[PDB]
């Protein structure tokens, strides 16, 4: 019976003296006792099923957060917290929802419900500042106990939620990675007990994974929309944070005056003289530029901007590469936003795009992801298949697009487009993209021709024009 049972720490492992012989592990591996990774503590179901239990004799009895107030979440989010009360730590650990519908609120509520000494992990200071703005109803004495805790200073019991910090490892002041042995954990190194991760996909990377791996970490919750990069690490995240409690939030459940119905499309474009000579012959990182700048595909992108500007729709055009961004945008004479565009000029372009009926198309680089209050529109065109994550295409779509007036309860009232050059490595991404969007509940189709592109003025009207671009791209 476990009334005497010791349990202790060595470098990244838990060893269990004079044992109760617990299920699901090897025995006398190198001594009479059981020995697991720290990170295996998460498997509380394997003892719970057996009817086994354990005690935290290493406890520290100091004080904790109360945060008694409540707020109102979206109908699935409320169902998702209600499930978490239901399931408990044996059968909980991540939630997936867009970066534009209430993820900050799920984190402050997840900490106010769970109610333990908490450390909040985030990607960015702006997101700490959005959390703070969310959290003001549960903030103790409004503004006299909230503080930041990162590379310049630390103070107070709370802040953006409870104490927030960043994932970073540049040196001894880049907080969570550097501090990962001092505080956290109620069961050993026992100052705190609860972990809330915003942007949770960020942690299972090869160096970062160690922050999570080198503890027992009692309660853990993660929140994300991108969930994984193109190589799919996600089997690891079940171990590292916990299993996935939720994924859906389909626009099928929020149509009539609520968000958008999006017609999704992929566009297959043919390939014009000289560009495949050179695509086929070049194996280097330049070849990405011949399939993105393919003038038949540029003419589809131009024709599509013209159709939706003729109807006065608002359009964001995404370009994965600053070269591509500027070659498309300067030719189409639409503003662009990227890293080196300043805050003053970005806020002028974005205010113009949202409120000026003359400024209806803009071009944007990778800087929108991971926190660029991207503006509202009704049309999204991606010039390329990229290598950022099929799941980030759906986060980006979801956070940017809304219903056009009048038509707020129809089958579709917003539009997404991804442009693909036929007979290239750009095509490989489609059978995955298509399967992921339809599994996310989206109506998605393939457009393979445009015989009305043969009825109007567009660029690259000759071989000589196309040759002028081909020489510039090759250089």
């Amino acid at each position: 019976i476990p009334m005497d049972l010791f349990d202790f720490y060595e470098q990244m492992d838990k060893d269990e003296e004079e044992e109760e012989e617990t299920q699901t592990v090897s025995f006398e591996v190198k001594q009479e006792m059981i020995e697991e990774l720290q990170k295996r503590c998460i498997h509380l179901e394997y003892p719970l099923l057996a009817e086994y239990d354990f005690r935290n004799d290493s406890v520290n009895p100091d004080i904790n957060i109360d945060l008694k107030p409540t707020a109102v979440l979206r109908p699935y989010q409320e169902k998702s917290l209600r499930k978490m009360f239901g399931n408990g730590r044996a059968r909980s650990g991540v939630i997936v929802l867009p970066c534009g519908a209430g993820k900050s609120l799920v984190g402050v509520t997840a900490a106010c419900t769970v109610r333990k000494r908490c450390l909040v992990l985030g990607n960015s200071a702006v997101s700490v500042e959005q959390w703070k703005a969310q959290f003001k109803m549960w903030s103790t004495i409004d503004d006299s106990q909230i503080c930041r805790f990162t590379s310049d200073a630390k103070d107070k019991p709370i802040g953006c939620s409870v104490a927030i910090s960043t994932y970073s490892m540049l040196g001894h002041t880049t907080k969570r990675s550097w501090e990962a042995e001092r505080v956290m954990e109620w069961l050993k190194t026992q100052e705190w007990g609860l972990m809330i991760l915003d942007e949770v996909h960020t942690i299972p990377a090869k160096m970062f994974r160690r922050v999570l791996t080198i503890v027992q970490a009692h309660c853990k919750l993660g929140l994300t929309a991108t969930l994984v990069r193109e190589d799919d690490k996600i089997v690891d995240l079940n171990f590292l944070i916990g299993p996935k409690l939720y994924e859906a939030n389909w626009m099928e459940l929020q149509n009539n005056g609520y968000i958008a119905k999006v017609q999704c499309a992929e566009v297959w474009c043919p390939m014009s003289p000289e560009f495949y000579r050179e695509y086929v012959a070049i194996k280097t990182k330049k070849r990405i530029l011949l399939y993105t700048m393919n003038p038949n595909k540029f003419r589809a992108c131009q024709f599509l901007i013209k159709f939706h500007e003729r109807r006065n729709d608002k359009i964001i055009v995404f370009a994965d590469n600053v070269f591509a961004l500027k070659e498309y945008a300067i030719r189409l004479n639409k503003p662009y936003i990227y890293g080196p565009t300043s805050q003053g000029e970005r806020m002028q372009i974005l205010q113009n795009f949202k409120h000026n009926p003359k400024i209806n198309t803009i071009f944007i680089s990778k800087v929108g992801d991971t926190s660029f209050d991207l503006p509202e529109a009704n049309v999204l065109i991606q010039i390329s298949s990229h290598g950022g994550s099929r799941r980030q295409e759906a986060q980006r779509l979801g956070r940017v697009l809304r219903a056009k007036k009048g038509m707020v309860a129809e089958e579709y009232n917003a539009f997404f487009y991804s442009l693909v050059s036929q007979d290239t490595q750009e095509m490989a991404y489609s059978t995955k993209r298509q399967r992921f969007l339809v599994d996310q509940g989206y109506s998605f189709k393939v457009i393979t021709k445009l015989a009305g592109m043969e009825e109007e003025d567009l660029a690259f009207s000759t071989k000589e024009e196309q040759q002028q671009l081909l020489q510039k791209v090759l250089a």
Binding site: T70, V72, L73, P75, L81
Partner: protein
């Protein structure tokens, strides 16, 4: 007697005597009657704490004012809304005569306030029996203690 009294105990409690008991009518099936309760329908429906129901504006505005309007507009029949006091009744229905500009029901109902008059009471019951939602016993507000309890 009092019509119903089946749990029996309160009368012997009040008397400090133990009468002979008897149930002395044949009753009809439960299905002709329906006795609902209302409190909310999603997990975000938190405005009904009623720690100070006489002061909780958000609670009066939310399902107390809003559920009444949903139920009355959907179920279009002659329906009387009973209240615990005049002050609640006045706050819940903005009416033609509002206690504030900030009150949360907009729909044709009739009032039943103090200085009721025996002749004036009948006018409101003539209106409710004749037609429309509104009248006395119809889409009208009355405090439960008040005269409407005599009925017609």
């Amino acid at each position: 007697t009092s019509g119903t009294l089946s749990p029996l105990d309160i009368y012997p409690k009040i008397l400090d005597f133990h009468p002979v008991t008897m149930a002395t009518f044949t009753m009809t099936l439960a299905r002709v009657c329906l006795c609902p309760m209302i409190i909310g329908r999603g997990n975000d429906q938190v405005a009904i704490s009623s720690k100070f129901e006489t002061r909780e504006d958000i609670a009066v505005i939310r399902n107390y004012g809003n559920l009444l309007l949903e139920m009355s507009a959907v179920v279009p029949d002659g329906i009387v809304a009973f209240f615990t006091s005049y002050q609640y009744m006045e706050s819940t229905v903005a009416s033609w005569y509002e206690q504030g500009i900030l009150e949360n029901i907009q729909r044709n109902k009739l009032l039943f306030i103090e200085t009721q008059d025996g002749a004036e009471t009948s006018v409101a019951l003539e209106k409710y029996q004749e037609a429309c939602e509104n009248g006395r016993g119809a889409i009208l507000l009355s405090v439960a203690r008040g005269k409407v309890s005599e009925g017609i």
